[PDB]
Amino acid sequence: MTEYKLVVVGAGGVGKSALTIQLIQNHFVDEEDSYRKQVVIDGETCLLDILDTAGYSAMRDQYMRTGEGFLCVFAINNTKSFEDIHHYREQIKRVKDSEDVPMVLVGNKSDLPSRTVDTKQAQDLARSYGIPFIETSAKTRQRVEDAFYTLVREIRQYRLK
Ligand SMILES: N[C@H]1CC[C@@H](N2CCCCCN3/C(=N/S(=O)(=O)c4cnc(N5CCNCC5)c(c4)C2=O)Sc2c(Cl)ccc(O)c23)CC1
Ligand SMILES: Nc1nc2c(ncn2[C@@H]2O[C@H](COP(=O)(O)OP(=O)(O)NP(=O)(O)O)[C@@H](O)[C@H]2O)c(=O)[nH]1
Ligand SMILES: [Co+2]
Ligand SMILES: [Co+2]
Ligand SMILES: [Mg+2]
């Protein structure tokens, strides 16, 4: 049965853990580990192996080398987290020595009114990076499945390249 190593990266407090737990338990966390889940996507069965990282170059480099797909998460109310997406993507590409790595840009906290990053701005960036963009709320569970499953789909597209 096919396994996919997924890695959730992004600045402190963007909601990496809340997103991962929302997929695993369907519950929103309140006041660093790996998770497993078997899912059917497009009629193929697979095992999702997800590493929830925190916002040591050797440890970092190991997960970026091991990871097959990366959810690059920013929060729509934190411009710095959005700007730092450059940094995560650059580090991944350097480690994997490839311009093409399955990735999905996720703008989390879509339920918040204090928005500092416009959907259009993140869409344009993702288009520049050649990766899907999805806005999520870990709070409401809006597009959480969508983000992880789009990522798996990207890994499969890549594997057929
Ligand atoms: N939960 C405790 C035991 C596992 C610890 N841990 C994180 C879980 C590692 C799970 C296996 N793994 C990996 N193992 S690892 O390369 O040796 C590794 C990478 N980062 C880890 N951490 C903890 C340190 N800070 C970064 C995340 C740990 C292990 C690392 O020492 S990589 C990896 C990827 Cl890319 C996807 C899915 C994975 O399951 C995966 C966390 C403390
Ligand atoms: N309103 C709202 N709050 C969220 C959302 N996702 C996470 N949060 C909140 O954001 C804060 C940080 O969430 P957490 O999941 O721990 O983020 P993290 O990115 O995993 N943090 P770290 O880098 O330290 O590991 C918490 O208060 C959490 O409840 C969301 O979609 N909406
Ligand atoms: Co609870
Ligand atoms: Co740079
Ligand atoms: Mg966390």
From Swiss-Prot:
| GO CC entries | cytoplasm; cytoplasmic side of plasma membrane; cytosol; endoplasmic reticulum membrane; focal adhesion; Golgi membrane; membrane; mitochondrial outer membrane
GO MF terms listed in the record are: G protein activity; GDP binding; GMP binding; GTP binding; GTPase activity; identical protein binding; LRR domain binding; protein-containing complex binding
Q: Which residues carry this modification: N-acetylmethionine?
A: M1
Q: Name one GO biological process term.
A: response to mineralocorticoid
Catalytic reaction equation(s): GTP + H2O = GDP + phosphate + H(+)
Q: Which gene encodes it?
A: KRAS
The UniProt-reported impact of K5N is: In GASC; found also in a patient with Costello syndrome; exhibits only minor alterations in its in vitro biochemical behavior compared to wild-type protein
Which Pfam families does this chain map to?
A: Ras
Protein name according to UniProt: GTPase KRas
Q: Which SUPFAM superfamilies match?
A: P-loop containing nucleoside triphosphate hydrolases (SSF52540)
State the similarity comment: Belongs to the small GTPase superfamily. Ras family.
Task performed by this protein: Ras proteins bind GDP/GTP and possess intrinsic GTPase activity. Plays an important role in the regulation of cell proliferation. Plays a role in promoting oncogenic events by inducing transcriptional silencing of tumor suppressor genes (TSGs) in colorectal cancer (CRC) cells in a ZNF304-dependent manner.
The enzyme's E.C. designation = 3.6.5.2
Linked pathology: Leukemia, acute myelogenous: A subtype of acute leukemia, a cancer of the white blood cells. AML is a malignant disease of bone marrow characterized by maturational arrest of hematopoietic precursors at an early stage of development. Clonal expansion of myeloid blasts occurs in bone marrow, blood, and other tissue. Myelogenous leukemias develop from changes in cells that normally produce neutrophils, basophils, eosinophils and monocytes. Leukemia, juvenile myelomonocytic: An aggressive pediatric myelodysplastic syndrome/myeloproliferative disorder characterized by malignant transformation in the hematopoietic stem cell compartment with proliferation of differentiated progeny. Patients have splenomegaly, enlarged lymph nodes, rashes, and hemorrhages.
The annotated consequence of Y35A reads: Decreased interaction with MAPKAP1/SIN1
What highest taxon heads this organism's lineage?
Eukaryota
Regulation acting on activity, per entry: Alternates between an inactive form bound to GDP and an active form bound to GTP. Activated by a guanine nucleotide-exchange factor (GEF) and inactivated by a GTPase-activating protein (GAP). Interaction with SOS1 promotes exchange of bound GDP to GTP.
Q: Which positions bear N6-acetyllysine?
A: K96
Q: According to its UniProt record, where is this protein located?
A: Cell membrane; Endomembrane system; Cytoplasm, Cytosol
Write out the entry's keywords from A to Z: Acetylation, Cardiomyopathy, Cell membrane, Cytoplasm, Deafness, Disease variant, Ectodermal dysplasia, Glycoprotein, GTP-binding, Hydrolase, Intellectual disability, Isopeptide bond, Lipoprotein, Membrane, Methylation, Nucleotide-binding, Palmitate, Prenylation, Proto-oncogene, Ubl conjugation
